[PDB]
Amino acid sequence: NFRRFFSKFNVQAPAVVVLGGYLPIGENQGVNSTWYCAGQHPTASGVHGIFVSHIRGGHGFEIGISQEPFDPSGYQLYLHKATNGNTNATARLRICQFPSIKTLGPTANNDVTIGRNCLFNKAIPAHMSEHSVVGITWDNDRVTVFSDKIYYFYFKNDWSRVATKCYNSGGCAMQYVYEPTYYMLNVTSAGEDGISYQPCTANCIGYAANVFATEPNGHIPEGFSFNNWFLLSNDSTLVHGKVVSNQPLLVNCLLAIPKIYGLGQFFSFNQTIDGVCNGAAVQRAPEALRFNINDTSVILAEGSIVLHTALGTNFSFVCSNSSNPHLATFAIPLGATQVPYYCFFKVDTYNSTVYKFLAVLPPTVREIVITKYGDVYVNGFGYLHLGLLDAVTINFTGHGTDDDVSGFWTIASTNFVDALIEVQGTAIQRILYCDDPVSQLKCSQVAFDLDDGFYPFSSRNLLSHEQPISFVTLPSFNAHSFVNITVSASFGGHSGANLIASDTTINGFSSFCVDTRQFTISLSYNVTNSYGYVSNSQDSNCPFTLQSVNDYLSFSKFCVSTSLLASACTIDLFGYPEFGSGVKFTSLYFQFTKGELITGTPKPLEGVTDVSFMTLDVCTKYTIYGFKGEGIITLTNSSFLAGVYYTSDSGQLLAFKNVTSGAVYSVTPCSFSEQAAYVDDDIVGVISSLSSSTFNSTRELPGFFYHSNDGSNCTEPVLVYSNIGVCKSGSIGYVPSQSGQVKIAPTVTGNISIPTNFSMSIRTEYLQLYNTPVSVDCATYVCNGNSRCKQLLTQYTAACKTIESALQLSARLESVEVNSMLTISEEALQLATISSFNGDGYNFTNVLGVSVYDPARGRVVQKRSFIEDLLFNKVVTNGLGTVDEDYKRCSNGRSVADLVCAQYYSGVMVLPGVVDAEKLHMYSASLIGGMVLGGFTAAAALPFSYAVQARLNYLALQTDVLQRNQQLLAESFNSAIGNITSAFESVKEASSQTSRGLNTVAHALTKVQEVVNSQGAALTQLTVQLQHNFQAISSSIDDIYSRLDPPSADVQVDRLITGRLSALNAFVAQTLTKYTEVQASRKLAQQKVNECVKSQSQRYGFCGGDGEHIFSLVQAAPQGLLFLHTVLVPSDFVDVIAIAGLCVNDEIALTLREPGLVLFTHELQNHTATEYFVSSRRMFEPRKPTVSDFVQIESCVVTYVNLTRDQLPDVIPDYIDVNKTRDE
């Protein structure tokens, strides 16, 4: 049955969980089984658990558990009930130094007397249902009993041996357990019903949400919940954001432990921890092991956590509901998580036993992490610090037995690692380790996903620095002198707060001047306190400290005087006795000038007449003629005769001369900047000045080297930059010069070509219309609401006023421009829906938007088009425009503020966009319906084919309008619309974006993405400036005004006011640039819609590239319009012989009136019958000539066709001969 047994694990009804431990192992499934169910009385060894599965009315039952060594000193368990009284059948149990009953019997053959020493020899009730299961499990000196509840007892034992007496019950009555098993409870209802257990295999462990399988490299597998893995923090916890921090998240081993079992284990920071790691174990000694639990009752037991320091000191962890270990008793009379618990560490050594206070235990402890270097965290807060730990012991107490096996409580052997952390709601949700060079680049910025582009990357340096030290100065006769400066004082007096004497001498004198080239300071303290020790501190008001002068500092002169000296910087020495007199010693005055005459040394340098020493062609830390730096020194062929050390015009050291031999050595940095080509979420290529790197292929561009994994040429550049383009596979190649559409220049005669077989193509263009109006409160942003700071701010006059003035002026101008810009006609809107609009052959389904009666307050809603859905949802980070937060609830203050309120509390308020996406979509639909609105009323809803025909006739008169003539154009338009939709649907899939560049969908969507990102990026960059401390005491103005007196505080706060105001001014400057840029785009859109959408354009190439523009339609876009310019492109050209004009009988010249009209001979009758046709020069539309198309000219030319009055009517059928007709 087993329903009741798993029902004893109190679990919520609709939850599915994973079981573990020494559970009953299934009647038949697996090897398992082997229920005895008969009085055979078997014997086994190494058993870790036994069970009884069926109570057939209360049959007899006997248990004998002992040690395999058969020791007499150990405790033996023997449970005996040879009774069938059910309720009265109270089972006899004797946990004693007890008869190790070998086979069977109340006493039987054994050793040890019955009652030599007993811990429990009472009677226990043993009545339960037939399907009830009772069992006992022992492991790690912990014993668990399943008698109607999951009991738990700590008991030092070794119970690998068991002997039983059995009575038959249903064929499966009692059993042993040797190894842990698992189960899957698909619970659906409370009680014994709706449980639906099933057997298991090693795959169930990963199914638990709070445990994971460690990757072989030690990283957390993706998708982990991080339910309780709080990020560690010494001072404060971030509530929402992204942080790159050094945290112990690189786990070596994860020990999933069932909640019903406690853990007693020795953990050392010097050895790989034991236990069965769920994932791929790493044989590395932990430095930070993280414990995950469910309830505080596990830890509250005294001595649960014992920390052993490297010195051997032990810290016993004690929790109690009192406060004074020294003056109160900590024997706990309370439990069940009642009242706050005050937890301490009891220092245990036979010198002095003191208690160190951790913190008030929170009402719910979920993760405690203990690391070496002496640091312990509770719920992600570093309450207490210690010295270097080396070992930790854990003595836990199972769980609360009221909700168990809801997975496992786990402990993780982790190592510190710098990882990018995404946290929202003060809880982790995803992580990214900063080890992979791609991951290193990602952690260089703060982002998990990076758009395609070139990102700066630093050349990898030597991981082991081991840098030799270089030091070069002028040659001179070597000479070293020690300057010691001995200070003599006697402090303390009475009670340690008095003084007696104080004096100092410099080499036995009150003043000294260094004459030898080398010198080394060595301060000595001849100070004695009558009360104890003297604490010494050193001041500094010089470019150097006493410890720093020995670091190869160079001077022309260096004189030290204990008294005031002219032009001498001051350094003071402070002496602190045990009780803190706080007085200072004599001030040290250092008069010095820059030069190479003398140099401080840490030790008298070797060498004769020259002390310089340096290492060639190795990344080294150098001090060259006072120029401290790190770089590579290489001998070069330069022969600069003058000078000693050479520097660029910017003051950077370039090369220095050996002077002794005349050789010069160039100084270059150890590492050089590199550009990493990051496309398709991977590093595919690196632009570097180095000749080689960790890539199998390397191509040398004229200006730089390029390393990648693909040496082939790149012909389809996914990403372009400067003169080069990079493919998605890492290939590099020059961008080919795309050949544009050919345009035929008009001419009066000779061979010409008339384009034909026109097919239309849609070219997409996006133009931004407006920006989100941002109004920042300058006063509250700068002063942070501090009244006393506003008085100082007022001294800056209009610097604060002009910011908001310009911001509001720009916002109002943009608002009024776009408001007067958007004109909407309701009649056009009527014809803009699928039911009304009728595109015969033209598929406008992807372009039009449906309209339904909205139940929301009745007002009808017109859903935006499918293309608009694709453009908005897939790009907008918030999904919808209504997500823009409102400030009505922002001042409530009853909930923790989010990012919007965080920036609003600093005076930054974001006004809603001037026009909603709904209004923009209705405007686009209005334009689409108006391009087919043939009359002032709705009764003139022309079919789109008629509008297309009219627009075709506008640019070239159609002489043969057949059905297929429009059908081919309609088919081409439908195909191009399908291509556009496929391109919008997804990137580089279902629509090959190999055709990429300007006037394409990819460029438009990249522009939309950058537009929607820049507005947030600027605001975040503004808000982060508040964190900066502009060389003041602190970033908090009230903190400054509290630490300092009013005079100095005003000076200090003025530093940040200038810093914040300059940062605020920088934001305005970039927004005005954005406003200026968007104004030009908006002005073009007004020109674009009038000259392309509301009417076809005679301007060549204005509406979406070259070709004959037939029409264009507009779709709503984020903060702008997406123009879809439909343009005709020819597929073939007809070659005909143009005619300049006609001259009949050499007496009347006759030429074409229309400049954009040609006359030619075509087809079979071009030369066999000499037939003449006229047509537009834009499209091939042959038409017989008419007298209205011809004009008379006073004179002829040679190029004109030579005809006679009889032949002319053949050329011009409409011509009539007045003389011939009248004379008949």
Ligand SMILES: *[C@@H]1O[C@H](CO)[C@@H](O[C@@H]2O[C@H](CO)[C@@H](O[C@@H]3O[C@H](CO[C@H]4O[C@H](CO)[C@@H](O)[C@H](O)[C@@H]4O)[C@@H](O)[C@H](O[C@H]4O[C@H](CO)[C@@H](O)[C@H](O)[C@@H]4O)[C@@H]3O)[C@H](O)[C@H]2NC(C)=O)[C@H](O)[C@H]1NC(C)=O
């Ligand atoms: C809360 O505040 C506590 C301080 O009370 C911080 O504790 C520090 O934790 C860091 C680790 O995050 C400790 O840094 C480690 O120091 C070890 C020993 O330091 C000696 O050796 C280094 C290197 O030679 C010397 O520079 C140093 O002066 C000491 O002489 C190092 O061995 C560790 O090396 C690890 O990092 C390096 C990279 O730097 C890796 O290459 C190594 O492989 C290794 O992984 C490490 O540098 C620091 O000592 C702790 N300080 C104290 C006083 O204990 C907590 O980190 C802080 N917590 C938070 C969340 O802020």
Ligand SMILES: *[C@@H]1O[C@H](CO[C@@H]2O[C@@H](C)[C@@H](O)[C@@H](O)[C@@H]2O)[C@@H](O[C@@H]2O[C@H](CO)[C@@H](O[C@@H]3O[C@H](CO)[C@@H](O)[C@H](O)[C@@H]3O)[C@H](O)[C@H]2NC(C)=O)[C@H](O)[C@H]1NC(C)=O
């Ligand atoms: C865990 O339990 C859930 C809940 O279902 C309940 O518990 C099961 C153990 C059974 O005893 C169910 O009778 C009981 O309602 C299981 O979800 C259930 O899965 C089954 C398929 O295995 C669903 O049956 C099908 O459902 C589809 C869609 O409704 C129908 O078209 C089919 O004709 C067929 O009926 C069943 O609907 C579904 N329960 C509910 C409430 O939707 C679940 O499979 C089980 N195991 C795991 C691993 O979760």
Ligand SMILES: *[C@@H]1O[C@H](CO[C@@H]2O[C@@H](C)[C@@H](O)[C@@H](O)[C@@H]2O)[C@@H](O[C@@H]2O[C@H](CO)[C@@H](O[C@@H]3O[C@H](CO)[C@@H](O)[C@H](O)[C@@H]3O)[C@H](O)[C@H]2NC(C)=O)[C@H](O)[C@H]1NC(C)=O
């Ligand atoms: C038709 O088109 C023009 C029109 O000329 C007219 O028709 C001719 C048949 C003659 O009867 C012309 O007298 C008449 O105006 C013809 O173009 C003509 O081409 C000839 C040469 O092929 C030109 O003569 C030249 O004149 C220059 C001096 O200007 C001399 O130096 C040359 O040696 C040569 O003789 C003549 O000027 C020119 N006419 C005009 C008006 O430019 C054309 O040849 C004729 N036939 C065809 C097939 O087009």
Ligand SMILES: *[C@@H]1O[C@H](CO)[C@@H](O[C@@H]2O[C@H](CO)[C@@H](O[C@@H]3O[C@H](CO)[C@@H](O)[C@H](O)[C@@H]3O)[C@H](O)[C@H]2NC(C)=O)[C@H](O)[C@H]1NC(C)=O
């Ligand atoms: C690990 O933790 C367990 C759980 O607290 C510790 O067991 C506890 O040890 C104390 C000290 O002996 C026991 O107190 C004594 O109990 C006996 C009855 O057994 C009583 O007669 C004494 O007067 C005294 O109160 C306590 O009962 C016992 N808890 C349990 C559940 O058995 C254990 O000592 C810890 N071990 C280490 C190494 O830290």
Ligand SMILES: *[C@@H]1O[C@H](CO)[C@@H](O[C@@H]2O[C@H](CO)[C@@H](O[C@@H]3O[C@H](CO)[C@@H](O)[C@H](O)[C@@H]3O)[C@H](O)[C@H]2NC(C)=O)[C@H](O)[C@H]1NC(C)=O
């Ligand atoms: C220990 O883990 C369990 C789950 O893994 C959690 O404790 C349990 O929390 C649930 C609700 O979160 C409690 O459910 C309640 O049960 C009562 C009894 O029927 C019911 O009337 C309520 O409506 C509610 O459903 C459940 O009792 C509780 N189990 C306990 C406390 O044993 C929690 O994550 C951890 N417990 C603690 C105290 O932190």
Ligand SMILES: *[C@@H]1O[C@H](CO)[C@@H](O[C@@H]2O[C@H](CO)[C@@H](O[C@@H]3O[C@H](CO)[C@@H](O)[C@H](O)[C@@H]3O)[C@H](O)[C@H]2NC(C)=O)[C@H](O)[C@H]1NC(C)=O
């Ligand atoms: C700058 O150029 C000078 C001159 O070329 C370099 O001086 C050279 O230094 C080396 C090492 O000190 C001298 O080697 C000699 O070796 C003998 C035998 O072991 C030893 O007895 C000498 O005391 C000396 O060490 C070398 O003669 C000397 N060159 C001279 C004097 O012309 C110098 O190393 C170069 N670099 C710097 C940073 O000064």
Ligand SMILES: *[C@@H]1O[C@H](CO)[C@@H](O[C@@H]2O[C@H](CO)[C@@H](O[C@@H]3O[C@H](CO)[C@@H](O)[C@H](O)[C@@H]3O)[C@H](O)[C@H]2NC(C)=O)[C@H](O)[C@H]1NC(C)=O
């Ligand atoms: C004009 O464009 C519309 C765009 O909606 C075309 O209508 C849709 O055409 C597809 C052809 O693949 C139909 O097939 C499939 O339908 C399933 C279920 O609706 C859908 O999940 C697929 O993604 C795919 O769309 C689709 O049923 C049909 N109707 C829709 C999407 O509502 C139409 O065929 C084009 N040509 C005309 C109207 O002549």
Ligand SMILES: *[C@@H]1O[C@H](CO)[C@@H](O[C@@H]2O[C@H](CO)[C@@H](O)[C@H](O)[C@H]2NC(C)=O)[C@H](O)[C@H]1NC(C)=O
């Ligand atoms: C701190 O605790 C450790 C162990 O908890 C003590 O080390 C034990 O010392 C006894 C000495 O009689 C040995 O028999 C044990 O084997 C040691 N245990 C371990 C794990 O090594 C240590 O003495 C304690 N130190 C103080 C100052 O209390």
Ligand SMILES: *[C@@H]1O[C@H](CO)[C@@H](O[C@@H]2O[C@H](CO)[C@@H](O)[C@H](O)[C@H]2NC(C)=O)[C@H](O)[C@H]1NC(C)=O
């Ligand atoms: C270009 O114009 C010439 C005359 O202006 C056309 O005449 C061709 O002239 C060549 C030269 O001998 C002959 O071989 C061809 O047979 C002529 N073609 C015709 C149709 O008369 C020529 O056809 C025009 N087109 C091209 C491509 O040259």
Ligand SMILES: *[C@@H]1O[C@H](CO[C@@H]2O[C@@H](C)[C@@H](O)[C@@H](O)[C@@H]2O)[C@@H](O)[C@H](O)[C@H]1NC(C)=O
């Ligand atoms: C402590 O560890 C020293 C280093 O050896 C290794 O240490 C860690 C990194 C693990 O890899 C461990 O398995 C190795 O032993 C030892 O030299 C030293 O003896 C160790 N000390 C003690 C007391 O075990």
Ligand SMILES: *[C@@H]1O[C@H](CO[C@@H]2O[C@@H](C)[C@@H](O)[C@@H](O)[C@@H]2O)[C@@H](O)[C@H](O)[C@H]1NC(C)=O
């Ligand atoms: C800690 O909590 C105790 C509550 O326990 C109750 O009182 C004791 C005396 C026993 O009778 C026990 O059975 C009860 O449940 C308080 O009595 C005690 O004062 C608290 N500690 C402090 C310092 O206030």
Ligand SMILES: *[C@@H]1O[C@H](CO)[C@@H](O)[C@H](O)[C@H]1NC(C)=O
């Ligand atoms: C237990 O013993 C009492 C006393 O004789 C009796 O009345 C009762 O029925 C017994 N119960 C069972 C379950 O045997």
Ligand SMILES: *[C@@H]1O[C@H](CO)[C@@H](O)[C@H](O)[C@H]1NC(C)=O
């Ligand atoms: C410290 O100065 C006192 C003052 O004369 C002197 O007697 C004593 O010897 C000095 N001690 C040292 C270590 O210099």
Ligand SMILES: *[C@@H]1O[C@H](CO)[C@@H](O)[C@H](O)[C@H]1NC(C)=O
């Ligand atoms: C300075 O102290 C050093 C030892 O630190 C000693 O060798 C040297 O002789 C002392 N010089 C003087 C002038 O006291």
Ligand SMILES: *[C@@H]1O[C@H](CO)[C@@H](O)[C@H](O)[C@H]1NC(C)=O
């Ligand atoms: C210096 O001259 C040598 C010999 O002519 C030559 O091998 C070397 O490449 C030259 N180096 C530079 C930097 O000019």
Ligand SMILES: *[C@@H]1O[C@H](CO)[C@@H](O)[C@H](O)[C@H]1NC(C)=O
């Ligand atoms: C790749 O480009 C280079 C530079 O133009 C050219 O020499 C080479 O032939 C190209 N590769 C192939 C396979 O044509």
